[PDB]
Symmetry: D2
Subunit: 131 residues, 4 copies
C-alpha cells in the first residue's frame, strides 16, 4: 500500500488550499508554508496545471510523535497536495497517518497522537474537499 | 542506515550547522531552499521537551516538475526534505528520503528515470557534504 | 506623511488576504509568505484581533528598482496588512510606492517600475478590498 | 526628514551574513519567518543583480505590544534585514531604525519599552552578523 489518500474536491486548487488552511487554523493548527508547484514549473519554462502543497500541523501533537521516533520529523508537519488534472478535475492528496506510523515504526506511546493526527487529517480533508 | 526509504547518516556537525551546510550545498548547485521547520522550537512553544530537531525543504524545480508531469501525487513528497536531529547521547543525525523509494511509492514510469537519478545525485551530494567535513 | 494607504475591506481578514494572493498570482506576481500576527499574539499569551500580513511581488519589476538603489530590497516584496479593529471592521493597509520611491531616493531609471508597482498595488488592493 | 535606514559593512558574504542574522536571532528567542533571495529572483527574471537577500525575523511578544498600540505597524513587522553585495565585492547589511518606525506609525508613550527592546534586538543581531 502506498499510504496515499486522494479525494476529489468540489473547489478549485486555490480554494481547496485556503479551505485546508482555514479549517486547520480553526482547530488550533499552525500553517507553516505553501509551495506552489505550478508556479515553480512556470518559472522553469515547463508546463504543469495548478498544483499546490500546504504544510500545517499542531506542534503539541507532532512533538509526542517525534519523542517516540525522531525520523517522523522528516514527514511532519502534515502535508496536503491540491492539484488539477488535465481534464479540469481537482484532487486533494494526503498521507494516511497510520501508514506514516508504520513507516517510522512508531510504538504505543504515540497511539493517542496518531489518532489525533488521523482525526485532524480527516476533518480538514473532508471539509476542504466538500461543500 | 536504510529502512522504508529512510536514509540516515551520522553528522560531524551540530543540527544547526548541518542544516546550514544542506542549504549552502544545495544553493551552490542551483537548487532553491523553500523553508525550514524548527521542530525543536515548536516543542518548546508547546511546553514539551525535544532535543534540537530541524527540517529543511529544498530542490530544483526543473527536475521536480518533470517528476510531477509523470505522477502528480509525488508533489506531496516534493520538494526534497532533510531532517537533522540530535539524540540523547549528543550525536547528530541527518535523515533523507531515498528518491528511488519515493518513485516506487508514486509508481513513476520510465520517462522519469533521468530525473530520479538526478534527484538521487542531488540528495547524495548534499547529504555527503552536510554530514561530512 | 506616513505613506500608509488604508481602505475598508468588504471581507474578513482571512478572505481579504486570500483575494490579495489570488489577484497577485493572476497578474504574474509571486506570493512569498504570509505572517499571521494574530496567531503570533495568541502563542505569546497576548490579545490581538485578526491581523495578517502577506508578501508578494513581481521579481522582474522589483529587480529594476534594486538595480537603482539596492536598499529598497529591504522594503520589497510588496507587503499588505489586513486587520480587524475592535468594532469588527476590516482594513487593508499598504505602502504608497511613490513614498517608497522617495524613502530610497529612486531615480529616473526606476520610473516605469514605480508606475508598474503603483498599478500592481492599486489593482490588488481594490480587488481584495472590493466586492 | 530622515530615511530610517541603517547600513553597516559586513565582514562576511551575503549568504553568511544572513545565516548569522538567523543564528543570533534564534539564540535570543526570536522566530525566523522567511528569507527572500532577491538575487535569485533577478536571475529568474533574466536580469543582472549581485547577491541580495532579505530575512524576516522577530519577537512576536514584543511585536504584539507594538501592534496593540497602532496596528498598522504590523505592515512593517516582523523585523527585516537586507544583506547585499555591491559592484566592488563589498557586502552591506541594512535595517530599519526602530525609532523611525515608531514615528511613522505614531506610536505612543506606552510602546517606549517595546520600542527599546526592538532597538536592542536589531542592534545586537546586526553587530554579530556584520562583525
Ligand atoms: F512588484
Ligand atoms: F520584534
Amino acid at each position: 500500500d502506498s499510504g496515499l489518500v486522494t479525494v476529489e474536491s468540489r473547489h478549485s486548487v486555490a480554494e481547496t488550499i485556503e479551505r485546508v488552511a482555514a479549517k486547520a487554523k480553526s482547530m488550533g493548527m499552525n500553517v507553516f508554508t505553501r509551495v506552489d508547484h505550478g508556479a515553480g514549473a512556470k518559472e522553469a519554462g515547463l508546463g504543469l496545471p495548478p498544483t499546490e502543497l500546504i504544510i500545517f500541523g499542531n506542534p503539541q501533537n507532532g512533538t509526542v510523535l517525534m519523542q517516540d521516533k525522531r525520523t517522523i520529523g522528516l514527514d511532519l508537519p502534515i502535508r496536503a497536495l491540491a492539484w488539477e488534472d488535465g481534464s479540469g478535475k481537482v484532487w486533494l492528496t494526503v498521507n494516511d497517518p497510520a501508514w506514516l506510523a508504520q513507516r517510522h515504526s512508531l510504538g504505543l506511546s504515540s497511539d493517542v497522537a496518531i489518532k489525533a493526527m488521523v482525526t485532524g487529517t480527516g476533518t480538514v480533508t473532508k471539509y476542504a474537499a466538500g461543500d
